[PDB]
Design a protein around this ligand. Structure first.
Ligand SMILES: [Ca+2]
Ligand SMILES: [Cl-]
Length: 496
């Protein structure tokens, strides 16, 4: 469950948040494959509640109605078509598995669901599964409200309803079996693994029993004995009875401390500075590198109300964001996930973005297709951070330097830092309020290297800045603090 199962030499996954299956299938072929992306995390592919107030929020996808593969992203045929086409070009699909719960307990009964299945929350009835009252934790939960009220009590966090979400009785084999059934369908179609939603709200043991029933990955694309890559969503910044480490037995775990600290550092808040990143990783209290799923931001916290709060960097803060994402992708700690977002009408009323619920670009509820501009950015209010040159090139940087050690670290005691990855890559950052002009040991073979932040290597030349590494591995870097992208990166495959 720890192996990503990506093609050899692909090291990142991208979250194509709320994208339609047909758009992801094309993206695999036209972009993710040739640019070296390892795979895609998709939004939950199972039927969910169609929430009409507010109008089709992003959060309705976290309220299952059944396990039919039928959502605004598309139907089962389109899902299968996407998984096949992506696998056929060496790009994996990872499914967002929402298995802790069904929908909100106060949602109205009816067929307001993305595949038209009937369900009745009040009576605990989901016949398209089917699940009935006996399949929920109503009788196990000990709080007066039936909901989670106190995070200091690990059992209620597991047995009670998260904000009213009907809590499945994962201790039961029948329930374990229906979820496994769904996950196996996905596995056999060709899925490489799963993001396990709301893992904190489930006993590590129940997750185990569910995973125990899973098939090996599809033997047309994956070697014999292959197991689904598992990464569990647990937000753990310390101070609670539940710990990320409680889930290591099942797979990787999201390391939410990662983006929270990095965002603090790059913004230079709370006394933090880049030179402190020299012992980035376990040195900062993070979980072991081999269990961490890292990211600068995710679909929840980019809206500003995750544990990292306001310190989380996003596409809205593009300049600092690119740098944070670049630092992440260059650094060997963890397995990296890059965010890909859509724009929404962000509106703050004293502290909250009252539009943080807004779903993807849409025409009356129908998700818009992703259009590609001539310069390869996206239209239809899809941000496509993964297509920004500065990020896309760093995705390749990580592939190029895979397995090389963190080395040749430099810092000026403030916010000018640099480091290498063995003899295959080197990156330099200026986050101080004056220019960074200095000759540095890069660890690389002598030559002329294209900076892949400023530009690209194409046909024996560079479209951007050129860095000259001499016989002793040293190179001069000059980065003005007024640079729009105040960082440079070069690697073995950007050498002329
Ligand atoms: Ca639960
Ligand atoms: Cl996540």
């Amino acid at each position: 469950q720890y192996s990503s199962n990506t093609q050899q030499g692909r090291t990142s996954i991208v979250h194509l948040f709320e994208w339609r299956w047909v758009d992801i299938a094309l993206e695999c072929e036209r972009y993710l494959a040739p640019k070296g992306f390892g795979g895609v995390q998709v939004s939950p592919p199972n039927e969910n509640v169609a929430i009409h107030n507010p109008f089709r929020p992003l959060w309705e996808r976290y309220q299952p109605v059944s396990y039919k593969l039928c959502t605004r992203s598309g139907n089962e045929d389109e899902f299968r078509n996407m998984v096949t086409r992506c696998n056929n070009v060496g790009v994996r699909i990872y499914v967002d598995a929402v298995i802790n719960h069904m929908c909100g307990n106060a949602v109205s009964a009816g067929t307001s669901s993305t595949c038209g299945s009937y369900f009745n929350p009040g009576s605990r009835d989901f016949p398209a599964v089917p699940y009935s009252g006996w399949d929920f934790n109503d009788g196990k939960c000990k709080t007066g409200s039936g909901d989670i009220e106190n995070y200091n009590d690990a059992t209620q966090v597991r047995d009670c309803r998260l904000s009213g979400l009907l809590d499945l009785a994962l201790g039961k084999d029948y329930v374990r079996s229906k979820i496994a059934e769904y996950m196996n369908h996905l596995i056999d179609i060709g899925v490489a693994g799963f993001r396990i939603d709301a893992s904190k709200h489930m006993w590590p043991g129940d997750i185990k029993a569910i995973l125990d029933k899973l098939h090996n990955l599809n033997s047309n694309w994956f070697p014999e004995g292959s197991k689904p890559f598992i990464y569990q969503e647990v937000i753990d910044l310390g101070g609670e009875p539940i710990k990320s480490s409680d889930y290591f037995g099942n797979g990787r775990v999201t390391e939410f401390k990662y983006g929270a600290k990095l965002g603090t550092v790059i913004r230079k808040w709370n006394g933090e500075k880049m030179s402190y990143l020299k012992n980035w990783g376990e040195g900062w209290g993070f979980m072991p590198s081999d269990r961490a799923l890292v990211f600068v931001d995710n679909h929840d916290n980019q809206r500003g109300h995750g544990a990292g709060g306001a310190s989380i960097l996003t596409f809205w803060d593009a300049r600092l964001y690119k740098m944070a994402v670049g630092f992440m992708l260059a650094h060997p700690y963890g397995f990296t996930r890059v965010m890909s977002s859509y724009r929404w009408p962000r509106y703050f009323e004293n502290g909250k973005d009252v539009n943080d619920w807004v779903g993807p670009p849409n025409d009356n509820g129908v998700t818009k297709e992703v259009t590609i501009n001539p310069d390869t950015t996206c239209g239809n209010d899809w941000v496509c951070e993964h297509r920004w040159r500065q990020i896309r090139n760093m995705v390749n940087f990580r592939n190029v330097v895979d397995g090389q050690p963190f080395t040749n670290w430099y810092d000026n005691g403030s916010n000018q830092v640099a480091f290498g990855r063995g003899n295959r890559g080197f990156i330099v950052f200026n986050n101080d309020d004056w220019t960074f002009s200095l000759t540095l040991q890069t660890g690389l073979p002598a030559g002329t290297y294209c900076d892949v932040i400023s530009g690209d290597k194409i046909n024996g030349n560079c479209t951007g800045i050129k860095i000259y590494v001499s016989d002793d591995g040293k190179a001069h870097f000059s980065i003005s603090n007024s640079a729009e992208d105040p960082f440079i990166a070069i690697h073995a495959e950007s050498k002329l």
